[PDB]
Design a protein around this motif. Sequence first.
Motif, PDB file in Angstrom:
ATOM      1  N   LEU A   1       0.808  -1.201   0.000  1.00  0.00           N
ATOM      2  CA  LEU A   1       0.000   0.000   0.000  1.00  0.00           C
ATOM      3  C   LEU A   1       0.853   1.268   0.000  1.00  0.00           C
ATOM      4  O   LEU A   1       0.622   2.160  -0.818  1.00  0.00           O
ATOM      5  CB  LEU A   1      -1.001  -0.023   1.163  1.00  0.00           C
ATOM      6  N   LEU A   2       1.851   1.342   0.879  1.00  0.00           N
ATOM      7  CA  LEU A   2       2.707   2.528   0.934  1.00  0.00           C
ATOM      8  C   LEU A   2       3.422   2.803  -0.405  1.00  0.00           C
ATOM      9  O   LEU A   2       3.589   3.946  -0.804  1.00  0.00           O
ATOM     10  CB  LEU A   2       3.708   2.442   2.100  1.00  0.00           C
ATOM     11  N   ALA A   3       3.825   1.741  -1.092  1.00  0.00           N
ATOM     12  CA  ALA A   3       4.508   1.853  -2.374  1.00  0.00           C
ATOM     13  C   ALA A   3       3.588   2.405  -3.469  1.00  0.00           C
ATOM     14  O   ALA A   3       4.047   3.117  -4.361  1.00  0.00           O
ATOM     15  CB  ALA A   3       5.105   0.493  -2.788  1.00  0.00           C
ATOM     16  N   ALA A   4       2.301   2.081  -3.391  1.00  0.00           N
ATOM     17  CA  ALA A   4       1.342   2.562  -4.362  1.00  0.00           C
ATOM     18  C   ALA A   4       0.994   4.035  -4.086  1.00  0.00           C
ATOM     19  O   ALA A   4       0.805   4.825  -5.017  1.00  0.00           O
ATOM     20  CB  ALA A   4       0.109   1.699  -4.352  1.00  0.00           C
ATOM     21  N   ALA A   5       0.923   4.405  -2.808  1.00  0.00           N
ATOM     22  CA  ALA A   5       0.737   5.800  -2.421  1.00  0.00           C
ATOM     23  C   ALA A   5       1.955   6.642  -2.842  1.00  0.00           C
ATOM     24  O   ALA A   5       1.812   7.751  -3.392  1.00  0.00           O
ATOM     25  CB  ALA A   5       0.497   5.900  -0.925  1.00  0.00           C
ATOM     26  N   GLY A   6       3.142   6.079  -2.623  1.00  0.00           N
ATOM     27  CA  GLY A   6       4.396   6.738  -2.910  1.00  0.00           C
ATOM     28  C   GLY A   6       4.637   7.081  -4.365  1.00  0.00           C
ATOM     29  O   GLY A   6       5.612   7.757  -4.665  1.00  0.00           O
ATOM     30  N   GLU A   7       3.771   6.622  -5.270  1.00  0.00           N
ATOM     31  CA  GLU A   7       3.929   6.918  -6.708  1.00  0.00           C
ATOM     32  C   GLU A   7       3.269   8.237  -7.173  1.00  0.00           C
ATOM     33  O   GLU A   7       3.472   8.653  -8.312  1.00  0.00           O
ATOM     34  CB  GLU A   7       3.437   5.761  -7.598  1.00  0.00           C
ATOM     35  N   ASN A   8       2.461   8.858  -6.323  1.00  0.00           N
ATOM     36  CA  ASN A   8       1.789  10.103  -6.693  1.00  0.00           C
ATOM     37  C   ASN A   8       1.119  10.079  -8.075  1.00  0.00           C
ATOM     38  O   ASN A   8       1.393  10.930  -8.922  1.00  0.00           O
ATOM     39  CB  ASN A   8       2.762  11.282  -6.605  1.00  0.00           C
ATOM     40  N   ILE A   9       0.239   9.105  -8.288  1.00  0.00           N
ATOM     41  CA  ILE A   9      -0.526   8.974  -9.524  1.00  0.00           C
ATOM     42  C   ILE A   9      -1.988   9.322  -9.225  1.00  0.00           C
ATOM     43  O   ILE A   9      -2.665   8.605  -8.481  1.00  0.00           O
ATOM     44  CB  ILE A   9      -0.418   7.535 -10.083  1.00  0.00           C
ATOM     45  N   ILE A  10      -2.467  10.428  -9.793  1.00  0.00           N
ATOM     46  CA  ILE A  10      -3.822  10.907  -9.515  1.00  0.00           C
ATOM     47  C   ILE A  10      -4.814  10.285 -10.498  1.00  0.00           C
ATOM     48  O   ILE A  10      -4.653  10.453 -11.712  1.00  0.00           O
ATOM     49  CB  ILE A  10      -3.916  12.460  -9.548  1.00  0.00           C
ATOM     50  N   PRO A  11      -5.852   9.584  -9.972  1.00  0.00           N
ATOM     51  CA  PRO A  11      -6.132   9.466  -8.542  1.00  0.00           C
ATOM     52  C   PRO A  11      -5.866   8.102  -7.920  1.00  0.00           C
ATOM     53  O   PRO A  11      -6.132   7.935  -6.736  1.00  0.00           O
ATOM     54  CB  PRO A  11      -7.634   9.784  -8.468  1.00  0.00           C
ATOM     55  N   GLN A  12      -5.357   7.144  -8.693  1.00  0.00           N
ATOM     56  CA  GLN A  12      -4.966   5.809  -8.170  1.00  0.00           C
ATOM     57  C   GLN A  12      -4.210   5.759  -6.819  1.00  0.00           C
ATOM     58  O   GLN A  12      -4.617   5.016  -5.903  1.00  0.00           O
ATOM     59  CB  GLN A  12      -4.089   5.063  -9.186  1.00  0.00           C
ATOM     60  N   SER A  13      -3.141   6.567  -6.702  1.00  0.00           N
ATOM     61  CA  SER A  13      -2.358   6.758  -5.457  1.00  0.00           C
ATOM     62  C   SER A  13      -3.113   7.287  -4.216  1.00  0.00           C
ATOM     63  O   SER A  13      -2.753   6.967  -3.073  1.00  0.00           O
ATOM     64  CB  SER A  13      -1.163   7.660  -5.722  1.00  0.00           C
ATOM     65  N   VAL A  14      -4.132   8.110  -4.434  1.00  0.00           N
ATOM     66  CA  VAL A  14      -4.867   8.708  -3.335  1.00  0.00           C
ATOM     67  C   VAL A  14      -5.782   7.679  -2.659  1.00  0.00           C
ATOM     68  O   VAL A  14      -5.918   7.649  -1.429  1.00  0.00           O
ATOM     69  CB  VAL A  14      -5.718   9.905  -3.809  1.00  0.00           C
ATOM     70  N   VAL A  15      -6.420   6.854  -3.481  1.00  0.00           N
ATOM     71  CA  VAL A  15      -7.317   5.834  -3.004  1.00  0.00           C
ATOM     72  C   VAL A  15      -6.533   4.870  -2.139  1.00  0.00           C
ATOM     73  O   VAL A  15      -7.036   4.393  -1.110  1.00  0.00           O
ATOM     74  CB  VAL A  15      -7.942   5.074  -4.182  1.00  0.00           C
ATOM     75  N   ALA A  16      -5.297   4.600  -2.576  1.00  0.00           N
ATOM     76  CA  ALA A  16      -4.350   3.736  -1.889  1.00  0.00           C
ATOM     77  C   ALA A  16      -3.933   4.256  -0.517  1.00  0.00           C
ATOM     78  O   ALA A  16      -3.725   3.465   0.397  1.00  0.00           O
ATOM     79  CB  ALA A  16      -3.127   3.498  -2.767  1.00  0.00           C
ATOM     80  N   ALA A  17      -3.810   5.576  -0.370  1.00  0.00           N
ATOM     81  CA  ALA A  17      -3.552   6.184   0.944  1.00  0.00           C
ATOM     82  C   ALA A  17      -4.732   5.960   1.874  1.00  0.00           C
ATOM     83  O   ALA A  17      -4.554   5.665   3.049  1.00  0.00           O
ATOM     84  CB  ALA A  17      -3.263   7.647   0.822  1.00  0.00           C
TER      85      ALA A  17
END
Length: 302
Positions: A240-256
């Motif tokens: 999860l942290l690795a997916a958040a750490g990519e800053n891809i809007i909005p995929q990364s935000v949902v992951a946070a």
Amino acid sequence: GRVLIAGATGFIGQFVATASLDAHRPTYILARPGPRSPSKAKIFKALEDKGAIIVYGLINEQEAMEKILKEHEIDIVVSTVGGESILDQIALVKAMKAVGTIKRFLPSEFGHDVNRADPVEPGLNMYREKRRVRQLVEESGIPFTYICCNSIASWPYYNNVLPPTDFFQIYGDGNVKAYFVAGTDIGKFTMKTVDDVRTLNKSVHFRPSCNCLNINELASVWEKKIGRTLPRVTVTEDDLLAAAGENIIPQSVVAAFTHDIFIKGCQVNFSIDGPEDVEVTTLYPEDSFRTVEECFGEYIVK
């Protein structure tokens, strides 16, 4: 009490507007000018038929919103705009202050308590944007209600519909609870709160006990429904942290957010016994939520 709704073509906004119309409240829908989408026409068609009045404006053109609020005599403003539009409400709030006749403002919340939860980036930034709107609302002396309705009852995928027909992805050890609420219960109870004295200047938390589940429990419900067991795989906090750490809007935000709910338990790790917080099931006793069982039930339709 005339209700203005912004973002009524949104995912949440569609549920809230219908509820208002079903509550036979006078309902105005703020719409964008110029030609429109196919799904958009299917929403405006249905709302209009249910008595909805369509007004044309944008919520970031302050002046336009003043003429709109004044001319149509609006008591109640519900904003349901998406997460990229959050700072656009800043002109709406300035507008409501100018005309000074507003009895309740619901900003676009419909998630967690943004003052209590500490998600990682870029979910964090979204909360910054929301917190900033809160500060502006309160400093402007506008009466408010914050909808903290937690999780819409869908399968809680990491990116982001129908639950998995292949195998289950369980976050962490899967023993961390969340609250799940039907789209229709979000709209109906939302509309109840708008002129309830007991919700004046409060956060409203949706906490139905029957819908308080962890992902293992939630997977098991789904298996009863389909009649057979799917495999369960672990998705880690690090995943999860690795997916958040990519800053891809909005995929990364949902992951946070997924890290906040299912790893850190943000939905349930705080008491609501204080005076600025109220809970829906206790405000409306003997009035039943829809169960995940019956929600998932209709997902089998198809």
